[PDB]
Amino acid sequence: IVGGSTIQPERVDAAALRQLGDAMRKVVGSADPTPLADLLSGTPVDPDELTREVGADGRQALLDSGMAVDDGTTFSSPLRGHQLHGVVVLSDPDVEEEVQHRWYVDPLWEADLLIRLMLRRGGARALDMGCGSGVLSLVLADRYESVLGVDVNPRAVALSRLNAALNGLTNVTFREGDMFEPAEGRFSRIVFNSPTNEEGNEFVDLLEAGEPILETFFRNVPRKLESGGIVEVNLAMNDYPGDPFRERLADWLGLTENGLRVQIFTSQRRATESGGEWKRGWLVVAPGPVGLTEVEWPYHDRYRRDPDA
């Protein structure tokens, strides 16, 4: 079972964690792997080689934080390292559904793609709903005065805090709780890699929570969004005969009454028995003329071709 390991960033001082993050930046994803990179790839490593790379302080920080365990003659990690978009990120390894713990954390299935879709603006306060590993909060940190990540998964909150500390971030904080309950005030930026995929209307688990998590999200967006702000959502969308997703969405958002502008970029789609349709896409609220517009943009295909678009 993968996804239940204990993660305790509070056991390591800020400087040591930043130093481990600097060490990860040097080697994670590099062509010449080092013991630290091997460790964060799932390979057991010789602790003496590790000590020479990250120091005795660093070695102990790996243990104290839960980034590594001493198996006896080797160190191993339950987590996997990533370097993307100027940040380093730990998350769970990508593993089949049947072996995931209740508190398994999105192993960055779509994060790299989603960061490339995100608008380059900045502002005052940003909110990452369902922050998971924290990855999207990390990239927002440069251009928002404050970034708040929220998750109902307490292990995600700890891992997000660890990742913020690895990257040396000061303005990124995380809170455990249910949707907007821990997010006070208004935000100029809200991002949400939503836990929706093939489950339709019914909650399965924290990574496939059902259409009701989108309903809660969009019903509360207007009272949580600063005027002229931006909302960005990765979501699965189910169209049923006579009952398209976009109509329920407009109702949740109060879209016309609030004068919001919304665009849905549909990338993937699968026709369903009934002639309805399943879609995966990217939903944006941004300043513009009131209304909802739907466009086809196969950004998954383009991304597989060449990410730099």
Ligand SMILES: CN[C@@H]1[C@@H](O)[C@@H](O[C@@H]2[C@@H](O)[C@H](O[C@H]3O[C@H](CN)[C@@H](O)[C@H](O)[C@H]3N)[C@@H](N)C[C@H]2N)O[C@H](CO)[C@H]1O
């Ligand atoms: C936070 N939003 C995410 C959302 O981005 C979406 O992610 C999808 C992944 O699930 C899927 O992974 C599946 O195939 C893997 C092997 N390739 C197995 O290892 C995984 O276990 C197995 N689940 C990816 N191949 C494609 C992704 N689009 O759906 C998530 C809920 O399922 C949802 O929470």
Ligand SMILES: Nc1ncnc2c1ncn2[C@@H]1O[C@H](CSCC[C@H](N)C(=O)O)[C@@H](O)[C@H]1O
């Ligand atoms: N009711 C709820 N409130 C807050 N987060 C929730 C929630 N229900 C599910 N989630 C969280 O939504 C997250 C989606 S996975 C996305 C993680 C990260 N933003 C990334 O892009 O990689 C999960 O961590 C899951 O625990």
Ligand SMILES: [Ca+2]
């Ligand atoms: Ca599952």
